[PDB]
Structure formats: structure tokens, C-alpha cells
UniProtKB/Swiss-Prot annotation:
Belongs to the bacterial solute-binding protein 1 family. WtpA subfamily. One of its GO terms (biological process) is molybdate ion transport. Keywords: Signal. One of its GO terms (molecular function) is tungstate binding. The keyword Signal applies. It comes from the Archaea. The keyword Signal applies. This is Uncharacterized solute-binding protein MA_0280. It comes from Methanosarcina acetivorans (strain ATCC 35395 / DSM 2834 / JCM 12185 / C2A). The chain holds residues 40 to 332 of 352 of the full protein.
Length: 293
């Protein structure tokens, strides 16, 4: 029996589960086998750990050209967008009080705990940092990032000659989050249960995931939420440097997919990517809360 191995970002879990189901229905006998991990880590499984996949889907298309081309990939297709929000539930502390204008004041309260993923492994993780630093200029409060992140982790920040803020992420084992304030996981979707059970009050994550789980959420200003092409110039004012030296830049969230050039089942992969980009895939993404490009 043939097998199609798909490596994908954690946030793609729900829609990709549907694609696997539809693809398997259209291709009896073929077993689509998915493996999820933060996008940077999903890519490194291929580029550093010697693992092989037929399809690689990332929550940040830019990781394909920056990490895979041309040794492990030669192209990428942009197929969806997303938006960063602050998720919560009816049991989250101060949930009935939080809104777009005061979310960071609520997170500043000592009895409130928030979660975000590992910036060294997951776009949702480095994006939580980008959004929070961009919030300083938007709300005219130069201590939002300092208070929420620098004071509670091993991350550090420097200002570049061009005025760009550069966030430095230490080795994963050295991020050392203040556990009374932060819960960290390798990828964003690993924090869903923590939010649902109340171990954390707020969660930096994609709007699509919040909608899929039925979480409530605070919409953030488009100038800082990485959702719109219109604000691309503002988003680029922040960058994150991973422990390995790779630098990612604030940008509109665009998902990208590719077929590694060392894939074992490239032909089947082509049919899968065709389904993803086609009308059936498009519909699955929109029904799961992710707008097209
Ligand atoms: Mg399967
Ligand atoms: Mg600051």
C-alpha cells in the first residue's frame, strides 16, 4: 500500500485532518500519514534531522525559501492567511473585562497567566513576541513587551540602526519562563488543553484555531496582529532571532506548501497539493477560519 507522508504546522491540524479524510476517500488504499510540529521544527525535521516527507506545509511560507531552497525544495505555493488573537474561555480570569483596548493591562496583573509557543520552533511562538512588541508603539506604552515578556523569560531585545526591534531568543532550555506568568509549549496547539482546563487564562494563537476550539478571543489591532498585507510596513519593524541565528521578520501571516525535492511519493504529493489549492481545499480552509491569500 502507498503512503503519503505530510509534515505540517500545528495550526493546520484540523483542516489537514479534513484534507486527509477527503484525499483518502478519493484514493482508496492510500494512507495519508500526518505529522505535526511547529513550522520551523517541521522544516528542520527535513533539513537537519534526515526525515522524509512528501508534503511540507508551513504557517510562515518564508521558512521554505530561507531554510529549504535549493537543497530540499525548489518552490512553494502560498495558499492561506491567518490572524493573531488572544484566546480565552468563560472561566479565564477577567474574561468579562478584557477587550482590544486593555488586554495588555489584564496580562500585566500578577494573578493572570498566559501561554505562547517556543519562538525557536513555531511561527505562532515568534509571532506572539512580534505582536507584543508592536503593541508598544500602537498603544504608546514602551513597557508592554518589557513587562510581559522580558521580565518573565530569557528573551532579550536590542534596537537596530534602522530602528528595527530585534528580539533574541536563547536556547530553548534557557527561555526559562516565570511559571506564575507563562506556560510555554513547542507549538501553539499544545496549549489548547491548558487554556480549556484553566491552567492558563490567555493564549497567543491564531484566530482559526480559536474558532475551531470554540475559544473566545480578543481581536487585536490590524496594525499589530500580522493579519493584513495593508500593514506589512509596520509589521517589519520587529524581527526575531532564533538561537540558531535564523532571523524572521514581522510580516502578514501567509501559509506556504511545497513538495520536498527528496520526497518519496512526489506524484501522489502532486495530487494532494492539487486538492489543497483547488476548490475543495479552499472550502475546507475557509470553513475552518482561514482566509485565502
Ligand atoms: Mg491516514
Ligand atoms: Mg518596551
Amino acid at each position: 500500500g502507498e503512503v503519503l507522508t505530510v509534515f505540517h504546522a500545528g495550526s493546520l491540524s484540523v483542516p489537514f485532518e479534513e484534507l486527509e479524510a477527503e484525499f483518502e476517500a478519493q484514493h482508496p488504499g492510500v494512507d495519508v500519514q500526518r505529522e505535526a510540529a511547529g513550522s520551523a521544527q517541521s522544516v528542520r525535521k527535513i533539513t537537519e534531522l534526515g526525515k522524509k516527507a512528501d508534503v511540507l506545509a508551513s504557517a510562515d511560507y518564508a521558512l521554505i525559501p530561507s531554510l529549504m531552497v535549493p537543497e530540499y525544495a525548489d518552490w512553494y505555493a502560498a495558499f492561506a492567511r491567518n490572524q493573531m488573537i488572544l484566546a480565552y474561555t468563560n472561566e479565564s480570569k477577567y474574561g468579562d473585562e478584557i477587550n482590544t483596548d486593555n488586554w495588555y493591562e489584564i496580562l500585566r496583573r500578577p494573578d493572570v497567566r498566559y501561554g505562547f509557543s517556543n519562538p525557536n520552533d513555531d511561527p505562532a511562538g515568534y509571532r506572539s513576541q512580534m505582536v507584543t512588541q508592536l503593541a508598544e508603539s500602537y498603544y504608546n506604552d514602551d513597557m508592554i513587551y518589557d513587562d510581559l515578556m522580558l521580565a518573565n523569560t530569557g528573551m532579550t531585545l536590542t534596537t537596530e540602526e534602522n530602528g528595527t526591534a530585534l528580539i533574541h531568543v536563547p536556547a530553548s532550555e534557557e527561555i526559562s519562563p516565570n511559571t506564575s506568568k507563562i506556560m510555554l509549549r513547542s507549538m501553539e496547539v499544545e496549549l489548547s488543553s491548558a487554556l480549556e482546563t484553566g491552567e492558563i487564562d490567555y493564549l497567543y494563537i491564531y484566530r482559526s484555531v480559536a474558532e475551531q476550539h470554540g475559544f473566545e478571543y480578543v481581536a487585536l489591532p490590524p496594525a499589530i496582529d500580522l493579519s493584513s498585507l495593508e500593514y506589512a510596513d509596520n509589521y517589519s519593524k520587529v524581527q526575531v532571532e532564533m538561537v540558531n541565528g535564523e532571523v524572521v521578520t514581522g510580516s502578514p501571516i501567509v501559509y506556504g506548501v511545497t513538495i520536498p525535492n527528496n520526497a518519496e511519493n512526489s506524484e501522489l504529493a502532486t495530487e494532494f497539493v492539487a486538492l489543497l489549492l483547488g476548490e475543495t481545499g479552499q472550502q475546507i480552509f475557509i470553513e475552518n477560519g482561514q482566509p485565502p491569500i
